[PDB]
Amino acid sequence: TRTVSEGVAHIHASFNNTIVTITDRQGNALAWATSGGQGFRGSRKSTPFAAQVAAEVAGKAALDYGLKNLDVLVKGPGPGRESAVRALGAVGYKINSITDVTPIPHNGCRPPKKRRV
Amino acid sequence: PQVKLKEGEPVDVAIRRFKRSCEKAGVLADVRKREFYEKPTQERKRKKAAAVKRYQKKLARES
Amino acid sequence: PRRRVVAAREILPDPKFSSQTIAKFMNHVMQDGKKSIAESIVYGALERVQEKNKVDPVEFFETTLEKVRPMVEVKAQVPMEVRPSRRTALAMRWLVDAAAKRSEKTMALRLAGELLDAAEGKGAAIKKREDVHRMAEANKAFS
RNA sequence: AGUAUGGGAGAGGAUGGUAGAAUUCCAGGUGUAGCGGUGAAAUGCGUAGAGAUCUGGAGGAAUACCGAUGGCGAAGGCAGCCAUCUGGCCUAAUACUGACGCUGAGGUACGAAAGCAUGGGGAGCAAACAGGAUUAGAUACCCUGGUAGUCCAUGCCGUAAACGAUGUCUACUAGCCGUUGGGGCCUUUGAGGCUUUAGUGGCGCAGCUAACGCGAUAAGUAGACCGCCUGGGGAGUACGGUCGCAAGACUAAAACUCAAAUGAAUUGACGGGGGCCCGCACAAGCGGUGGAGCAUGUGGUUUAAUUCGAUGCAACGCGAAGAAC
Ligand SMILES: [Mg+2]
Ligand SMILES: [Mg+2]
Ligand SMILES: [Mg+2]
Ligand SMILES: [Mg+2]
Ligand SMILES: [Mg+2]
Ligand SMILES: [Mg+2]
Ligand SMILES: [Mg+2]
Ligand SMILES: [Mg+2]
Ligand SMILES: [Mg+2]
Ligand SMILES: [Mg+2]
């Protein structure tokens, strides 16, 4: 029902999974997909292919709202961060800009202990 | 980074430039550093080793 | 091998039609060194197809092998582009394997049948080609 | 050796305030199936709506980048920014006192982390503990939660591989190359080049050392004072005493037992160390064994006897190139 011309894309890339959520400006959600949810439920969730599939499905779902130009914000490490923008370009969104938003604490909270494996 | 894209900029080249900007910024290494807490004694030893390697590199270059 | 590279084994062309492709397919058909029976089978199939529809046997065989030839593979799993020799080898192997499982009594007429099926577009070799294409698409992102 | 006067650098100490990033939790908006985690999983969270994104609020703790064999402090140790109180150090000249110095048994002050007593605080992390995995077993390593504690005020505790494994102070003994804080001198293209001083690093002559190595920051050449050791265990243990709320700390033996226990370095060998390289070793292919009948050898059973040897690779169509007598 709602029609919006411009929007934002958020890529939460981690070492185990990648979430792609396409929202409008002001952060109201419009669509969301996950590498694990889009099949590939295993150690392959972190592989670039699953991120590409998630981005493709999210873009196809979000096309219903008539979004042609997108801004990309990418958070955190993890394979598949690059694949999301490639999939968005393939599905046809015109990427105005791509930016990184990974948080950096200024020596705040103590991290967990080192694994002995 | 804020890699603004030209009208005719290909997506692949844009992603390459964004990767270069991220590498220059060094955010990824900072994110890696905080994954696990490192003890002060280990950090001091690591910095000592780094300084020792740096001085040897400088002497080798001068030679 | 670890050290050095072995050159390709030259195969003399088929005496009757002067086609290295035909010779290679004939050797694919051969078993236990029975070259005479392999030659009988292949020449008989080519003559049968030529009589059925008037076309140059070499041209028709090349055209059909072009349709049945694959395009991509995955190596242990990352996709890769197949080399020209492996393309032809896989195509011929698929044709002979599908003929082996076909239900007709003999082998020569049963080979001609599969040739016509592949030319039309429906066949076991074409299905295997489509399957490898699907699996390569599924593993596309890697590499 | 000390004093007065001008300048300089600094995470030196104490008290108060303040700023930005991030985690956690709490409300609201969009929105609907997973989220999270591992080598792979599972426990756990989510349709009374999780995770993702946006807005607002609460609270604790630590200060990215600068950052540096950089800096300061007797040692322990000290990191964002601002104010107040305050110790030491460096540096130039002049002017003063006139040996006022070095070390130091007893004694005394300070003294990481953990731990203890009272009161407060508690985001994240996390002994103990609970659950899920791995394993023959798992009281562990891995995963999901999680208490004391980690934080603040006021005291106690006297310990660390509290290490340069190198007590303090003074004088002398080739050179070369960095760097931090000052003094002096010379060029100009506005920043460079020489010296000297107090720190902090890398080589190296002589000399020293069992060797490794040290070498003006000595483990060299000499002086003054102090502490300490006399084979390995028993053992920093018992008894007695002192200190402590307690945990414990400090002082400190004997009986008994052995011929050893040790340091450095040299050849080998080995490493679930690093590497380099080969072979039908893998990979790419063709055809087999493992399933059926039969031939042959072996292990077991059986027999009066089933004669004796060969037993992972490297025994089993092997000695036997040939048991009806
Ligand atoms: Mg973890
Ligand atoms: Mg004294
Ligand atoms: Mg734990
Ligand atoms: Mg205080
Ligand atoms: Mg001691
Ligand atoms: Mg220390
Ligand atoms: Mg000592
Ligand atoms: Mg005692
Ligand atoms: Mg093989
Ligand atoms: Mg043996």
Automatic annotation (TrEMBL), chain A:
Domain of life: Bacteria
Keywords, comma-separated and alphabetical: Ribonucleoprotein, Ribosomal protein
The protein, known as: 30S ribosomal protein S11
